[PDB]
Design a protein around this nucleic acid. Structure first.
Ligand code: ZN
Lengths: 49, 48, 86, 812
RNA sequence: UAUGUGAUGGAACCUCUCCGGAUAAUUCUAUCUCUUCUG
């Protein structure tokens, strides 16, 4: 199937639409802390399944 | 998304920031664990 | 509407599930029986409470404590394996 | 036209039939399948068969001609079009060029295998490769043009611009283009992105683009624009060579700019033959686009090398800055130029920063009456540079009067940006639904993105005078310049009238506040009092870093303690800035840990520096109180608890709506008690709303047209839950009390964090039991409930903030 | 195949937009086939 689809897109033009790519761009950000986060005193005490 | 609709928030999580976002949306999902799931009774190919 | 995306890899095969490792304790750490027993108790409790490791859900089983290559870091590129009979 | 003459207009891709009048079927097919047909009814026509000369069996030349025509039209008449037309034209050209490039690349790929067996046949294959390179260069041009006008949504640079610039750079490098690569590098540099490595150095790109370049008779440099980018490239190259510190030569540092000016200056124009100077009636000296856009470059080079004056370029530079909006890249270029001068150390920054700040204020004042300034990418830098220049020229002065006037100027500079918050692009784009003028301004700013020489723009109460009081005024200010982080606090002594300056560090205070905020937000709603230890640590750090406040008690003792009459004017005014709006400044603890600032000094805050010379009139209605209270069915406990107030004279209005608040505003009572919950919004501070029967928000209250008169307002909505959590020290937001003070109210009392009911009801009872003149006495009598031994008392009784006005403070 | 007094990556919905539509009476009369031998 995929092979025949490729042959069609190749040999048979005007059979399909293609302004498909818009508003995407991949993004991957990371940043290390600059200040000490500190310490807390509230922790878990229950669990639900 | 459902919990944000319920609590009426507009959080985006802004990917990586200087400090953790806090706020209830990011304070409740930080303590929720969800298992992945699979189709228990269906394995046939789908329709077009 | 979507704003951003990235790429992931997932392994769901049954064979590649169980992972095994070990912890090494030197002679100085084993100062006496009491300290080793307390360390084992704390380690067992912590191992019990572990829930998620490496993007998945798992549980840890701890056994009894009793005992006595190159990555080709040069320039190289290889991808797009496709499949057989292509 | 010497063209196809089928398209109705370049900016609207439509064809009004008439395509079939031509004979080439390929042209008709291309014009039909890739353009809008226009008209309102279907069109059914065809050509005649049996046509010779074949059909040429391809579409690549026609598509290339369409792409070239579209790019030429965009280059020529791109200024007059609107944003949507530019986007549409650029997208269509990119699509056509991409299709042509894909077809050519596929053809080359298939031909490569066949020519491999031809014994290394150098033939039209080379011409196909050259055509592919030309198409790649055109694609790079189109991508750069599209990226130059991307709308900057959000605080940071959008990713779309980054990917577009990367694609343009890749295409230009693969196409072996030097001028386009230099342009892409220049655009990348101004975006502050640093994805390039040492191999892809900006210096090498500029050198390649500028190596062996002369005016000559080259067609590419015939137009003035390309000369302009050549001049910009040369200027940036000289700047980077000087900044490398490897070219620190006494003679060459001026020789490079001298030859740059010689290139800029008249290159010995020969051949005019002295054409009689035929008295062209002084035709207004019509400045060409070349000088119109190179005024900035001329000013820069004159500053760099000019031993004499340079005011001629300053004259038209000032008007160019005044006419054009803040989205023009010239503003960022000027700010970066000022920063570079300040780092180098030439007084031009000192004499220019104040002028640029004044021009920026004048341009920003022409906005709507809503008092918004919009988010300019580099705006805090200009204000910080102006403040630092004022301080530096104050320090070097040898006259006391000059010192005082420069300190007053610095105080005015700090004051200028303390009330109007910037609201990004998308936020006010959404907010601009109601106002058409705001929509017009947004459209103008969007059109101003990219390039210059726009015909639309061309064809067109004393603040520091005298503070009359016997108290002390503190004007905090924080400098957020990257390499010169510091803090400042201007103190104005009423007795002496002289201003003072000093410096302090705020990073430990920021860290302590961050820890307290995290521990407070992570706690449950009913257990918010557990943050007492973190609050005490924050207060102790504040006292440690602000010890200089306690110094004035020695001067007070020297002044009136020796005098027979003690208890002089000990009032204190605080003007918080940036993140200092959410910390207990009055809760500072002395270094030894035994003295509290609130114990000795009566501290009150104010949103800005007061300058109004009118005292609010006495209330028209002498009603005692106007309690307004709403709650959900869950929290009936608060409604049950509040009964001591309803015993007192009140026409209780439970489950009241915003219209009740407006009606109360119509007839202002002596005291108003607005007690309700609140919710915060991150997109707009103007969307911060109160949890009444309806939603109040800030935009509704901003325009009311009815002013209070001497109404003491008590707000039950805490600041922490009315505002979003704070990340990074940079903050620009408005508070409910700040907007209430614009309505002629007397004073506003608020709570910084949740105050549980016993304390708020006791405070309400005490303030209602107070009389008219001595109301502030019982208001300030809460000091007896604050002690350092018990942290709970500090948590409970340090959350009260009073917005007392200057014109009424210290008045007896 | 880590390197150890410091990992919210369970810290992110492949989302959004688009009539399997258009045109056609389950109807009906002219031949078919090439080599015959002097006639
Ligand atoms: Zn959040």
């Amino acid at each position: 199937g995929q092979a025949l689809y490729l042959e069609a897109k190749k040999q048979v033009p005007n059979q399909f639409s293609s302004e498909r790519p818009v508003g995407a761009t991949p993004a991957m950000e990371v940043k290390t802390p600059e200040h000490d986060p500190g310490r807390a005193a509230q922790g878990p005490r229950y669990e639900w399944l | 998304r459902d919990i944000k609709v319920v609590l009426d928030n507009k959080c985006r999580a802004e990917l990586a920031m200087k400090q953790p976002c806090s706020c209830p949306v990011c304070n409740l999902m930080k303590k929720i664990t969800i298992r992945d799931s699979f189709s228990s009774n269906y394995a046939e190919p789908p329709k077009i | 509407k979507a704003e951003d995306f990235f790429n992931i890899w997932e392994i769901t095969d049954g064979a590649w599930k169980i992972f095994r490792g070990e912890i090494q304790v030197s002679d100085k750490g084993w100062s006496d029986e009491e300290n080793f027993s307390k360390f084992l108790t704390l380690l067992k409790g912590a191992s019990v409470l572990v829930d998620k490791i490496s993007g998945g859900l798992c549980y840890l089983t701890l056994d009894k404590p009793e005992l006595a290559l190159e990555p080709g870091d040069d320039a190289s590129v290889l991808e797009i394996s496709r499949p057989p009979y292509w | 036209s010497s063209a196809f003459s089928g398209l109705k207009i370049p900016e609207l891709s439509v064809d009004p039939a008439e395509v079939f009048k031509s004979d080439n079927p390929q042209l008709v097919s291309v014009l039909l399948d890739e353009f809008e047909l226009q008209e309102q009814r279907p069109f059914f026509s065809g050509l005649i068969p049996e046509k010779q000369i074949n059909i040429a069996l391809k579409k690549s030349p026609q598509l290339k001609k369409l792409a070239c025509h579209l790019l030429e039209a965009y280059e020529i008449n791109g200024r007059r079009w609107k944003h949507a037309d530019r986007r549409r034209v650029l997208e269509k050209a990119i699509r056509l060029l991409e299709k042509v490039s894909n077809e050519l690349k596929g053809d080359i790929q298939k031909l490569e295998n066949n020519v491999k067996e031809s014994g290394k046949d150098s033939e039209e294959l080379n011409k196909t490769r050259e055509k592919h390179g030309e198409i790649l260069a055109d694609m790079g041009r189109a991508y750069l043009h599209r990226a130059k006008i991307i709308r900057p949504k959000g605080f940071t640079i959008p990713a779309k611009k980054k990917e577009s610039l990367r694609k343009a750079l890749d295409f230009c490098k693969e196409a072996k283009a030097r001028h386009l690569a230099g342009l892409v590098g220049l655009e990348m540099d101004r975006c502050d992105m640093s994805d390039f490595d040492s191999e892809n150095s900006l210096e090498k790109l500029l050198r390649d683009a500028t190596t062996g370049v002369s005016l000559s008779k080259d067609q590419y440099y015939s137009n003035e624009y390309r000369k302009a980018e050549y001049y910009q490239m040369c200027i940036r190259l000289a700047e980077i060579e000087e900044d490398k510190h490897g070219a620190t030569d006494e003679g060459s540092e001026n020789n490079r700019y001298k030859r740059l000016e010689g290139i800029l200056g008249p290159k010995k124009s020969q051949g005019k033959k002295k054409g009689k100077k035929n008295k062209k009636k002084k035709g207004t000296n019509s400045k060409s686009a070349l000088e119109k856009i190179m005024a900035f470059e001329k000013f820069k080079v004159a500053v760099y090398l000019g031993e004499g004056k340079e005011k001629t370029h300053w004259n038209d530079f000032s008007e160019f800055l005044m006419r054009y909006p803040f989205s023009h890249p010239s503003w960022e270029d000027s700010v970066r130029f000022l920063r570079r001068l300040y780092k180098k150390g030439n007084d031009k920054w000192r004499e220019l920063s104040v002028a640029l700040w004044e021009i920026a204020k004048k341009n920003s004042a022409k906005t709507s009456s809503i008092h918004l300034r919009w988010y300019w990418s580099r705006q805090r830098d200009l204000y910080d540079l102006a403040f630092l220049s004022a301080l530096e020229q104050a320090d070097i002065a040898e006259d006391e009067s000059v010192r005082q006037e420069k300190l007053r100027l610095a105080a005015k500079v700090a004051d200028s940006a303390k009330n109007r918050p910037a609201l990004t692009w998308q936020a006010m784009e959404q907010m601009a639904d109601k106002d058409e003028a705001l929509k017009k301004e947004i459209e103008n700013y969007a059109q101003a993105l990219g390039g210059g020489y726009i015909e639309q723009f061309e064809k067109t109460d004393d603040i520091p005078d005298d503070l009359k009081t016997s108290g002390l005024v503190v004007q905090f200010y924080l400098v957020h310049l990257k390499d010169y982080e510091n803090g400042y606090a201007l103190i104005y002594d009423g007795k002496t009238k002289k201003w003072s300056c000093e410096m302090f560090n705020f990073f430990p205070i920021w860290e302590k506040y961050l820890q307290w905020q995290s521990v407070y937000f992570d706690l449950p709603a009913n257990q918010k009092e557990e943050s007492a230890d973190q609050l005490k640590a924050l207060c102790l750090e504040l006292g440690r870093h602000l010890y200089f406040l306690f110094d004035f008690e020695e001067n007070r003792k020297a002044h009136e303690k020796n005098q027979d009459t003690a208890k002089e004017n000990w009032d204190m005014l605080f003007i918080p800035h940036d993140f200092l709006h959410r910390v207990p400044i009055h809760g500072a603890i002395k270094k030894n840990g035994t003295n509290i600032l609130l114990k000795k000094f009566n501290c009150t805050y104010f949103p800005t520096l007061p300058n109004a010379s009118i005292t609010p009139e006495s209330p028209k209605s002498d009603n005692v109180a106007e309690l307004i209270e709403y709650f959900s069915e869950h929290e009936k406990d608060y409604s049950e608890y509040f009964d001591k107030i309803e015993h007192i004279f009140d026409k209780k209005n439970r489950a009241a709506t915003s219209q009740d608040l407006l009606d109360a505003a119509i007839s202002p009572p002596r005291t108003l008690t607005i007690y309700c919950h609140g919710q915060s919004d991150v997109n707009n501070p103007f969307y911060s709303r109160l949890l009444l029967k309806d939603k109040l928000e800030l935009i509704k209250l901003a325009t009311l047209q009815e002013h209070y008169s001497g109404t003491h307002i008590f707000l039950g909505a805490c600041e922490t839950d009315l505002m979003p959590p704070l990340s990074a020290p940079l903050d620009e937001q408005l508070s409910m009390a700040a907007m209430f003070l614009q309505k002629g109210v007397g004073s506003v009392l608020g709570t910084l964090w949740e105050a549980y009911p016993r304390a708020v009801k006791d405070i309400v009872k005490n303030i209602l039991s107070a009389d008219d003149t001595q109301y502030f006495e019982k208001l300030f009598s809460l000091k007896k409930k604050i002690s350092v031994n018990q942290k709970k008392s500090l948590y409970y009784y340090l959350c009260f903030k009073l917005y007392r006005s200057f014109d009424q403070i210290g008045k007896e």
